[PDB]
Amino acid sequence: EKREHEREVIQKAIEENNNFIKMAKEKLAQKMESNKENREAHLAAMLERLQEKDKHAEEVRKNKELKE
């Protein structure tokens, strides 16, 4: 009974070192994923705003042409 308790203790220590490593690895991957997403969405929205301003500058040149 005692040997089997010995086995249990040490397998538990391995299991815990492992679950800790695993958890860390996952936590990192989720945060880096969410990070890239968010950053990209900010740049995309910026570029979208700029591009609307380009389109608007067509409708201002195209519209000066329509006074003739």
Binding site: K2, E6, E8, V9, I10, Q11, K12, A13, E16
Partner: protein, 422 residues
Amino acid sequence: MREIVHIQAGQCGNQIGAKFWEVISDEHGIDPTGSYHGDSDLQLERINVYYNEATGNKYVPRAILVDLEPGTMDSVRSGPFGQIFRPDNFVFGQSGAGNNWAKGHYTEGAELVDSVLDVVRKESESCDCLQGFQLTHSLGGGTGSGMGTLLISKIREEYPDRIMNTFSVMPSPKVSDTVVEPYNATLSVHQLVENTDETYCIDNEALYDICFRTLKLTTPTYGDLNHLVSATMSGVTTCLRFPGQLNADLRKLAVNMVPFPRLHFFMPGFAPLQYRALTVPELTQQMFDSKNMMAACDPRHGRYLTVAAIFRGRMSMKEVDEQMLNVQNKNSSYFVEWIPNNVKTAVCDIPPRGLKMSATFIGNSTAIQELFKRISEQFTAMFRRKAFLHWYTGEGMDEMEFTEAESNMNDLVSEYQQYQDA
């Protein structure tokens, strides 16, 4: 040929084990080379209890040296009698045990135990009639304590009908390495209650006090403490190492000193701690004074269940009995009456180096409960706030094993109290 296999583990275990071998090797006339140059055969008649013979007829300790890091054993090796030991008999890891019982018992120590059992098996198998085993260790660290107890379990499994004996150094705040010492000792005592037949409780509190309030050493080193331990260990093993009117062996000792299987924790005593030899009456008074005890319990707080005492040197056997009998019949409040003739006395002619008279005492007293209380109180002061426990849960232990170890120590205390009052 009633051989004993000696094992020493951890820093404390190897430091005092080494001194031990220094002392007895000198008493048996062996030099640092394993070569005999003594003048009697009283030195050689039972030399085989502790020493194996060599090819050139040299003597080599039946000793196994164990540690989870190499430092101390490098020191042992480079010390005075370092080369006497069988080099195959040094068994060690590299990583240490961090004053952590769990690492010695369950993780780091588990990885080394089998190689130790291999050297053990190699030493047992060439024994004409092996008596049992003797382990030197402390209970407050990680290796001697965790791994030492693990070892005792394995040895009991492989040699269930041999005697297991320990010299166990108990921690004290006075002379302390780390705060987790009570945890490690409470876990270790629990093993010792189930798996030893005889344990000599060597309290570091007492050794400090004898060193400070008596030897007048103002800053006592571990060498000072180990010098007392060395003397006590030599005295306590005199009757095994030497021929007398008694044939002493470990099993007979256990039978005559242990009336209840769990109460096998002994308080040792020594006298003296000098050109004037002591007289028999002084030996007798000193030995039984609390100040000559090495466990830091006062024997007047409890009762003696049993006592074994030797006197070393050439003296008056008649005066011994007179004095022995006298100190009983002056202090009958402190011996049990329901165990007739519970104090036994012997004499060896060979004294130890540097004394012409000495006396050593082995007492099974209920006053030893004081020691276990001291540890329990300290354990509980931390455990009630689960302080410091992460060091052990991180090696796989649960609080449960703690709660149980606590419980079994308090039961031990209750048991000693029950017999102090019978």
